[PDB]
Symmetry: D3
Subunit: 311 residues, 6 copies
C-alpha cells in the first residue's frame, strides 16, 4: 500500500561521468561574470522594499526576478524561491513580497524561457511541445542544465549582498521549484536549508509509466514523434544527469518535503524515490487527501522549519 512506497528506492541511473559533467558545468558558470543589477520597484506594501534583480549566468543569458527585502536594518536571513513548471504568473511578485513580510530577504528566480528570464541556449533539434525535451539528446544541450546552473548562481549573487546573512540562506519551491531547490542544494554549499513540496524531475524512468498528466508526459509525447530506439536510450541517458535520485546523494542540508497521495502530476513514488536517496537530516510530510496543489497543512509546517533554522 503506502508501506511499499516508504520502502521504494529505485536504482540510480547516474552515469560514470555524473560528477565530472557537473564539475565541468560549474566551471563554465564560473567563467561568466555575474554583473548583478538592482532596481527599486514600487509595490503597495509597507515594511518591505522591492527590487528587480538581474545577473548573468550560463551561456551569458540574463536571469531576472523580483527581490523583496524586509524594510529593516539587516543583515537578514534569505530565501531563493523557485516557481513551478509553466506556473509563473506576474513573476509571482505577491508571494515574494509575502515572504519578505515574514522576515526573509527573498528572491524569486524566474526560470529561463518560462518565467521571464532569458534562455540563450540553442535548440539542437525537434522536441515535444514544452521545455521537458528541449536539447534532450545531449546533457550538454539539455534545457535544465542552464536552469540548474542559474539556481546555483542565484545563491552566489544574493549571498554577496551586505543585507543578507550568507550563513542563513534557505532554498524553497514546489514541484519544479522543489526540484530546483534540491538540485541547487546538491550543487552548492551556500544554502543552509531545503524545502521541497512534491518535487519534480525525479525518477524519470518511472515517472513516465505512472504520471497521468503533464508534463512528465512530454517525454512520452517526444518518443511518440521519434520512435528511434536509439533516441529513447540517449534521452533517458541525458535525463539521468538531472534526475533528483542521482543528485539527492549530494544534499547535506536539512531538508523538508511534502507529498499528496493522490498527486497525479508528480506521482508519490517518484517523490519517495527522491526522498529515500537523501542521506541527510530529512523529513517527508505525507498527505493522504491531497494532490498536486497548495497544501495548507504543509505551509505551516515549512514556516516552522524555516523559522527554526533561519530566524
Amino acid at each position: 500500500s503506502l508501506e511499499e512506497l516508504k520502502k521504494y528506492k529505485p536504482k540510480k541511473t547516474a552515469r560514470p561521468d555524473f560528477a565530472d559533467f557537473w564539475k565541468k558545468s560549474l566551471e563554465e558558470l564560473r567563467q561568466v561574470e555575474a554583473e548583478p543589477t538592482l532596481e527599486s520597484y514600487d509595490y503597495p506594501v509597507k515594511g518591505v522594499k522591492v527590487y528587480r534583480l538581474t545577473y548573468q549566468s550560463f551561456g551569458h543569458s540574463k536571469i531576472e526576478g523580483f527581490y523583496a527585502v524586509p524594510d529593516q536594518t539587516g543583515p537578514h536571513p534569505a530565501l531563493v524561491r523557485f516557481h513551478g513548471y509553466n506556473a509563473s504568473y506576474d513573476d509571482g511578485i505577491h508571494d515574494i513580497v509575502n515572504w519578505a513580510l515574514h522576515g526573509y530577504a527573498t528572491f524569486g528566480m524566474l526560470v529561463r524561457g518560462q518565467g521571464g528570464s532569458e534562455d540563450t541556449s540553442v535548440t539542437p533539434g525537434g522536441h515535444a511541445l514544452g521545455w521537458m525535451t528541449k536539447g534532450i539528446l545531449s546533457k550538454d544541450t539539455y534545457y535544465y542544465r542552464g536552469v540548474y546552473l542559474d539556481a546555483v548562481r542565484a545563491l552566489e549573487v544574493i549571498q554577496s549582498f551586505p543585507e543578507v546573512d550568507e550563513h542563513r540562506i534557505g532554498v524553497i519551491g514546489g514541484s519544479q521549484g522543489g526540484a530546483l531547490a534540491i538540485a541547487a542544494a546538491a550543487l552548492s554549499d551556500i544554502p543552509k536549508v531545503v524545502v521541497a513540496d512534491y518535487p519534480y524531475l525525479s525518477n524519470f524512468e518511472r515517472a513516465v509509466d505512472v504520471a497521468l498528466e503533464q508534463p512528465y508526459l512530454e517525454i512520452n509525447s517526444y518518443f511518440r514523434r521519434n520512435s528511434d530506439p536509439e533516441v529513447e536510450e540517449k534521452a533517458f541517458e541525458t535525463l539521468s544527469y538531472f534526475d533528483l535520485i542521482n543528485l539527492a546523494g549530494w544534499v547535506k542540508q536539512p531538508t523538508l518535503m511534502a507529498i499528496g497521495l493522490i498527486d497525479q502530476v508528480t506521482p508519490p513514488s517518484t517523490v519517495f524515490a527522491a526522498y529515500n536517496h537523501l542521506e541527510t537530516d530529512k523529513e517527508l510530510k505525507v498527505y493522504r487527501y491531497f494532490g498536486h496543489e497548495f497544501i495548507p497543512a504543509f505551509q505551516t509546517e515549512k514556516l516552522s522549519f524555516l523559522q527554526k533554522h533561519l530566524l
Copy 2:
C-alpha cells in the same frame, strides 16, 4: 451561417512597415549560404529514392527533412510539404515517400524546434508553454520569422536540383503546414501552386476569441501570465507581421483550400478570413461534418488540383 462566413473579411492588421520588414528579413536570409547536403537513406520502397536533405537558413540554423524522389529519369515536378503544429512523427517519412510515389520529388521540411530542424534564435524572455509566443514581443525575434524564412529557402534549394523542374513546384500542408504553404507562396515566386488544409496562423485577433482548443490559446495563456496591457498590444503587433490575412494579398499562385465547419482548433472564420483576402485564382472546399482532421474527400480534391497543375 455559411452565409455570414462567406462574406467575412476582417480589416487587415498589417502595420505600415509590413513590406519593409519582410524585404529586410529576406535580405538577411540571402546573407546565409545554403550549402545544401544530401545523403541517401534506406527505406522499404521500390521506385523511389529517399534522401536526408540539409541546408542552412536564417540565423545559420541547420534545417532538415526527408527528400524522396521518383526513381525515374527526371526532371520531375516537386512538392515542399509542411507538417502540422507539434504533429511531426518520425519526420513524416511515410507521407513523403507516398508523395514521391505519386510522381512528385517532394521534400518534407521539418519546422525548427518541433520537427527536427535547428532553431538558432535566442529566447528573449518568458513565454507560454509552446512555440506560439516565443519571441512574441518583437517581430525580429518572433518564432515564425525564422520558420517562414526556412520555407522560402526550402524552395530555393530544391529548385536548384537538376532532377527538379523549377517551373512545376507546388507547396502544400495542413494547419500549420497550410499557413507555411501560403506564407511561402506569398514571399516567393518559386511555387507555381498552393494547397492549404484548414490553415493556421490566421486572423489572430479573432482566433483568440473563438478557439476552443489549442494552440491559438497559447496566446491567451501568455496574456494570463503577463497582465501588462502594453504586452498584449506589442504581442498582437508582432503577430500581424505573420498573419495570413496580411500575407494573402501577395499570393498570385492558384491556391486550393479546405475547411471543416466543426473545426475547433482552426475556426472556420479564421480560415475564411484568409481565403477572402486572397486575390488570385482560388477555391475553398467546405466540409460541413469535419473538424481539424484528415478529410478524405479533400485528399482526392488536391490530388486532381496538383495533377492538373504539376503533372500537366
Copy 3:
C-alpha cells in the same frame, strides 16, 4: 459584448417589504449578546499575534474564525475577510496571517455550516445538495439570512476592539466572500471600504440561465426535484431578499470589484448587474483572459485600494 455588459442593468426584484425584512432581522440580531471569546493561537510567524475569535450571532449560533493582529502598538486598520463557497481550507489561516503582515488586524469569519461556524437554523424541508437552497421556501428560514447577519456582527465585534481603529475597517472577499462583503457594507455603516472579487449571489434569475458550473446550478437542481410551479415562484421570491442587485443600492462605501470575462461559475453578466446597481464611489476591473480564479493583476489593485483608504 463588453459593451452590452457595460450597459446591463436588470430591473430590481426587491419585494415591497424588502427594507422591513432586513430591519426586522438586524433587530433579531441585536437581541443576541455577542459575548466574544479570544484565545491566543501559536503560528510560525513573527510580528503577528494570532487568535481564535468567537461570538454569538443570529439564532444563538456561535461564529468562529482566526483573528490575526500586527504585533505592534495599535490601533490598527482592520479587515473582515469572507471565504468562498465551500472553499474554506483550514480556516484560511495562512491568508489571514498574511493580511496581518500587511498591517491589517484581520478576521476571517467562517461561514456557518460551511467553514467552521455553527448553523443553528432548522432545515424546514428538502433541498438540493449544498447550502444554496436550504430554507429556500421562506426568507425567514433561508440559509444566507443567518450568514448575512453573522457578517454584520463580525463588524460589530472587531469594531469594539481597542486595538482596532473603528473608522478604518475594510470588508473584503471573493465570490461568496465578495457577496458577503457587499451585503455587510449594505447592511452596516461600520465598514469604510469594500473589495469584492467576482461577487456571488447576484442576479439569481439570470444566473440560473447562464451558469455552466456549480453552484448556481443547485437552484436548477432543486427545481428538478420539486416541479411544483409554486415552489419556483416562492424560491425566487425569497432569493430576491439576498440578491446583490437589490442590496447594492444601500452601499455608500467606496467599493472595488473584479470580473474575468471567461468566468463560468460567476457569469460576467451577474457581476456587472451588481456593479451597475451600486450608486457609490465604485470601480470594476475587467480581465479578458481570466475566469473564477485568483487574478494576480487584481491582487495588486486591491492592495493599493486598501492601502490608500485604510493605511
Copy 4:
C-alpha cells in the same frame, strides 16, 4: 476478485458504548409524541388511495411522505420505502403509488433535510458540501442519528394503522434507502423483512479509499478542509455508530440484498462487508455487469421475496 469479496469481513469498528448510544437515542425518540397526521391527496389512479402522512420524531421534527393504500378492504401488508441520497424527485410519489398497486400499503419517508422533511438539528460547525459530514464531530449531533430514528418511528406510526397488518411490514430501499432499511430493521423488531439494493453508509473506513464517485467522497472532502489529525479520528469514531457493519449484527429479519460488480458509488466490497456481518436469513444477489443503477433482474427478485413473505 469475486472470491476475495465473498470472504471479506472487516473487523467491527463499533465502540464500547455502541449499544448504550442507541438505547439512549431510542429513549429520546420515545420522548416525542407521534401525533401523526393524514390528509387525502388526489392522484390519477384507480384502486389506490393516496395520502400525505405527517408525524413527529427526534428533535421535534415533522417528518412527512406520501402514503398510498390499496383501495380494498384490509388489513394490508405494509412497506416503508426509503429513497436514495439526494435522489428524491417529487417525493417519489409515482413509485409509492405503484407499490400500493402491488398490494402494499406503503409509505415513502422523506429523509429530513433532503427528501422533503424537516431537520431540526443544529449544525455544530463547518462541514463538506452535502449531508455526509454534518455534525460529524459527535455521534449525538450526527446527521444520520435523526434520520435513523425517523425510520424507526415511521414503522411505529404505520404499524398503528388499523388497515395495516403489523405482522406483515417490510422495509425496503436502494443505496441510502437500503442502509435505512437495514438500520431500521436493526433498531426495531417491527419490520418482518428487509430488502436493500446496494446499501449505503457501510464500511466507512474502506469506502473512503475505494469510492471513485460521490458521495463517500464528501468525507474525504471534509478532511481536506480540516487537516487536524484529531478531526479525522473523531469523524471515523462517530461514523462507526452508524456503519452498517456494526448494525448488521442486530438484524434478525430475513433480508435480501443486491450489488453490481462495477458499482463505483457504493463499492462492492463495502456492500459485501455489510452482508457478511448479517447473521440472519440473508441472501446476496450479485450482478456482474451493473453499477449503481436500477437493476431489472433484482426488481423481480425482490417482488418474489416480498410476495413470499408479505402477501
Copy 5:
C-alpha cells in the same frame, strides 16, 4: 427563446410520393398473416396476468413483447407501449406490468433488432454504427420502414383480442417510443389517443445540426464515412418518409407531448417542429429544467390524460 420555439414550423420535406409509399407499404403488411401467439409467463405480481405475445409482420419477421393484462373480467382499455432507442432492458417487463396494474391491457412491442424481435430485412450496404442509417439509401430498405409497420400490426393484433376494447386503445412511448406512437397513430385509425415524451425521428435536417449527443449523430457519422454528396441527398430523401413533421399531418387522435428545454439528445426545436405540424387536438407540456430523461411532472400528466380518455 421559448417564443421562437413556439413559432417554429419548418417546411415539410415530404416527397410527392409520400402517401403512395405508405399505402404500398401498408399493402405489403396486409400481405402477411399475423398468426399471433400467446404464452403465459410467470411474474411476481398479483391482479395481473403476464404473457409473451408473438406475431408476424412485414417481411415475415417475428415480432415479440410482453403482454400484461389486468387479472379481472374485461373488456379492458389497452396500451401499446414503445421503448426507447437501444434502451430496452429485459424487454422492459417491469413497466409493462405496472401499466397493467393501472388498469390497462398493455403490450410492450420490442423494436426489431434492438429489443428482441426479429429484423428480417437485408442490410443493403455499409452504414454508421447503430440502426439510424441501416438501409438509409432507399425508403424501401430503410430500417424504420419495417419497425413503423410492426407498430401498426401491433395495434391490429391486440385490437382483435376479446379482452381488449378496440375503441379504447392508446399508444404511448418516449423518445423513439414517442415517434413510434405518433407514426402508428398517423398510419392507423385504431389508436384513440397518443402520448409521446420528447419524440424522436423528427426534423432530421435540423436535428443533425443541433444534436450534441447520440443518436442523431449517427447520420453525421454516416456522412463522414461516405463523402459522396449525392449520398447526403439520397439519405435525407429517404429520411423524409419517416420524419414526424411529415407524418404529424395524418394524426387525428388527441395527443399529449412533453419536452425538456435542456434536452440535448432530442433537441427542443425538433420536438416543437413535430408538434407544430399536428392539426389535431394537441398539447405540449414544456419543462424548463429537464433534458432527455424521466420527467416526474409529466408522468402524472399522462396518467390523467390516459385515465380521462381510456378509463
Copy 6:
C-alpha cells in the same frame, strides 16, 4: 508487466465441434458461385489502375471494395486489406491506391454492413448497439461468420486474376482488419503471409473484463440488457468459434504482429494471447508508448516484411 504478458497463454475455449463448424461453413460458401465483377474507377493517380470489385459470398450477399493494380505488366504480388471496426471512410480508397503504388495488386474488402458490403443474414433477435452482438445467440447466425467467409472468398477471387501471382498473396489489416487477416489465413491456404496490427476479436472472455473502451464493451452492454444467465453462457459459446485464440492454431503462414502497451481498445493481454497461440514463423513488435492508433514505427516494419516475402 511485459514479463507476465509474454507468458500469458489462456486455455483455448474452442468447443468440440469447432473444426466441423468451419468445415460446414466453408462448404456453404463453396455453394455460392463467385460471379465476380470488375469496373474501372477513376482516380487521380499515375501508374495505377483502380477498379470496383464485386463478388458473391456466404448467404448470397454482395461483397464489395476497391481494387487497385500497379499499372504495368504483371503478374503482381497481391494484398487483401481489411479495415477496422466502423472505421471505413470512403472505402479507404486512398490507402488502397497507395498499396498499389508500393507494387501490390491490392483489394480492400468492405465488411458487410460496415464499410459497404451487403449483409444478407437475418437478425435473429435483439442485440446491443453495434455489430458485436448481432446473432450472438448462435454460431450459425453470428455476424462474423459471414464476414469471416467473405474474407476467404476475397482470397479465392483475387487469386484467380491473371495479373495476380497466386503464390505471392498477403493478408493485412489493423484491429478488426488484423483479426480478419488472421482468421482468413487460418481458414485458407491461399495467403502466403499475414500482417496484423493490434488484432481484434481475441480472448473474448478476458477482453470483456479489461477493455476500457468500445467496442468489446458492446458485449457487456448486451448482457446488461439481457440478464438471463443462459444468455451469457450461449453468447460466450458462440464467440469461441471466432476467437483468435482458437483460430491461431491453424495459421501456418509467417505472420507479423504489433501491439501498443497503452492500448485500451484492444488490450495488450488479448493480443498476446492470440500471439502465444500461434505456432508458426511469427513475431510480435511491442510499442511501449502507443495505443490503438497508427504506429509509424510498425509501418516501416511491415513494409520490409511484405517486401521480403512478396516482392522478394
